[PDB]
Each structure stands twice: as structure tokens, then as C-alpha cells.
């Protein structure tokens, strides 16, 4: 398999975190890609192992590292085949330069391909994110070399933000939702061009309201596998 | 700890693609977790060049068995102790891959069928021509008790149309064809609707209310049978 897998241009999902975003991940690379059939749809294998420790428990809290659990897990994509891995989590990327670097398989970072998809008018950004993917400012550099200004909520707002995002992971999106619309009001009575789902939990929570929401939200995990599907159109015999 | 320890399950989809995505969400939906740490661990193949499983058996059209034996190897490798297949027509090989299988398989025909009510002896039968032709449902079924409500062969065109609909990805046009389908067989006397095409909870998601009858959902079956496999371990919560 892995041979003829490799020659496919295979792309291996390093998710788990969480398990309905990896999902929602799934979904998007049948939405988002053009296919006469079954057999036209992109080769993929999905690590969908959520033991992987919290993101933010370690970062923020002292927490077991996940990074040996993602290391494993790259290598095991890889060794089923996997030229192409993609991660749909965002605070996890705060170690996609380590992983990048141990790795064979090419990685598309979630960060370059979310903030590629912003409209170009929009300069003043909401963020909805983890307390860690804030804290640790994986968007921050790269929102700067853009030229772009993110807006997070205050501190009590980002405790609801937060809030949500593991109400989604329990299983309760209707009481997510109500968690996070109050947040993206006011983001946009701030002053927000567009809002980044900058957790791979948020579109889930979203999803049915985008109509009832102003502003643009980017789809952080749509942005990934929209990359991921340009990368594997890319080889001449695709 | 290795996958193998771990209890991981293998998850041997791309049959179709979509249909692969909606075990996952159920995976998700039908395990009491509390957090992302509880939930199943699962590795997915969801590699659709699988050929067409209808094409091979009534057409002889390439046959899928060497693929899904690659691909069961690599999920194997990968660390799976238990594998399930979200595609009804792909069990015709089922036997035949459990043979080749170091890891654990169950069958979507045998989860499906134990998760219909006792009172209902009638059953419609949704699935692809080749799962009807092949019978794979009909032992079962007579080992069960059951009697089996197929299509006539102008609804069972229009049932694989909706199939097919939505695998080209237009659930809009795929409920419009099956939605009468159903009424038939429930007007036939359908006291239950095994939905035996992955593809089909798809096509009736968000419809099972106007539906006078309960809808046996082969994928949800499935993903509840492998759930019991994994909290079974003496070592497992
Ligand atoms: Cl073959
Ligand atoms: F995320
Ligand atoms: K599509
Ligand atoms: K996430
Ligand atoms: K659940
Ligand atoms: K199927």
C-alpha cells in the first residue's frame, strides 16, 4: 500500500483534536472538491486518536505536552503513505515548525492558509480562539507581516469564547451556541471587517447563523483543506 | 502505548467519501464522552479509488477486493484491532477479507439486523442493485425471521439514482427521488426501512419525522456495534 498510496499523492489528517472537527474536516474535502464520483474524490487517511493531551492545559497550564503524541501519529500517516499532512486544530501548530521539521511528507500550515483567505479590504480582524492559541500569538506574527489588526474579545468575553469551544467538545452545540453569538456581536460592535474561526470548533458551532451574522467569518478548517486540494491538483498526473 | 494496545478501531471507508464522514460524526455522536480524551481512537481510510462495487458485480467491472485488502493491511499496520466498513455492497467480500484480517471485523449486515425492533417482521430493504442482487441481506434475514420489502424495478432504479445523486454531491435532487420510494414501501406494508446504502441516512437526514415509519440506519449500527467492542476491554472506559 504504501508505495502505490505515496504515488497517489495521499494526504494523511492528523486530527483528534477534536474529534468532530476532524469530522467537519472530512466533510469539507467532499464539499470542496469537484468530483464526478466516488473514485474522483481526494485519497485520504485520518488519525482521528484523541488522546492526544489538551492544547491548552499544557501550554497555559502546566499540562502533559501532546507534541510526542503528534510526532507518533505524523509518523504513522507517513508510514501508511501520506505525502501531505494537514492538522485541523489551530493551537496545535504551536508545534508545526517542530513537527515540520521531523517530517517527510510535506505540511500546510492552518495559520498561512486561514489568514490567505481573509478579503484583502478586511484589515481590522476578529479572533475566536483558544486561550493558548492567543496566548502563545500563532496568528500574531503573521497577521503583522500582512498588515492586518486582529481583535480579540476581553477577558470575560474570552472566557465565554473558550466556554464554548468545550461545550462543543462535550457534545452540546446548541448551548455553545449560545455561548459564542453574544461574542461575535461583539466583535463586530468593535469594529471587525471579519471574523476568524480560529478553532476548528468554532465553525461547528456557527454553522446554520452565518446568515444571521454581519460580517465574514473565515473557516479556518475550510481554508486547510481548500490548500490541501490545491496542493494535490498541483501533480501532473492530477 | 501502541494502537494495537490502545484498542484502536480501523475505520475501511471511501465508500463513498461522504458516507465515511458520517460514521465519523457519529462515532462522535454516539459515544458518552466528556471531553476530546474519551472519545473512540480511530484511524480512516477514506481512499475512494476503491473501483466501483455495483460496476464489479453485475457488470464485471475491476474488482474492489485487492484494494480493500490493501487497504485493510494498512490500517492493520497502522495499529486497528477492530475494522468496520461503512458500505453495504463491499461485504460481499466480507468473508473473504475476515480471512485475510488479523484484526477483529464487524459486520454492518449483522449490526444493522440487531438493531431492528422485534415486532417489525416486514421490512423494506434500501440499497444498491447489487446489494439486493447478491442477496446479502436474505440468509440473514431468514436466519431472523424477517421478510424483506425490495423496491419494484422502476422504484429500484430511482432508489440507485439517489444513490448515486448524492455520491455526485446533490442531496437536494437524491431526496426528491428517494422520498417517494419510501411512501411506496411503506404503503406496501413496511413496518421498518433498513436504510442498507451508507449513502442513504444521508439522503433522509433531517426527514425522519415526516417518515411514518422507523428508519434502521446501517451506518449508525454499525458505529454502535463498534463502540460495544471497544468499551467491552477490561482496560477501556
Ligand atoms: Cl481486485
Ligand atoms: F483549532
Ligand atoms: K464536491
Ligand atoms: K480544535
Ligand atoms: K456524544
Ligand atoms: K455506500
Sequence with gaps: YFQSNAMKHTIGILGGMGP???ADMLEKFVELRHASCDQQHIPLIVSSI???????????????????????????LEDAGAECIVIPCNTA???????????????????????????????????????????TGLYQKKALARGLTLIQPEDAGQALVMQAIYTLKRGDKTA???????????????????????????????????????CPMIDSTASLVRAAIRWYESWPDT
Design 93 to 135: 501548530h504551536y508545534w508545526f515548525d517542530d513537527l515540520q521539521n521531523v517530517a517527510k511528507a510535506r505540511m500546510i500550515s492552518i495559520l498561512d492558509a486561514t489568514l490567505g483567505d481573509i478579503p484583502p479590504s478586511a484589515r481590522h480582524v476578529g479572533l475566536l480562539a483558544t486561550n493558548a492559541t492567543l496566548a
Design 20 to 22: 468532530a472537527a476532524t
Design 176 to 214: 455553545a451556541q449560545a455561548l459564542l453569538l453574544p461574542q461575535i456581536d461583539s466583535l463586530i460592535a468593535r469594529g471587525a471587517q471579519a471574523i476568524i474561526m480560529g478553532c476548528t470548533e468554532i465553525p461547528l458551532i456557527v454553522a446554520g447563523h452565518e446568515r444571521a451574522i454581519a
Design 50 to 76: 484523541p488522546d492526544i493531551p489538551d492544547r491548552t492545559a499544557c501550554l497555559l497550564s502546566g499540562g502533559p505536552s501532546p507534541y510526542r503524541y503528534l510526532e507518533r501519529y505524523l509518523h504513522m
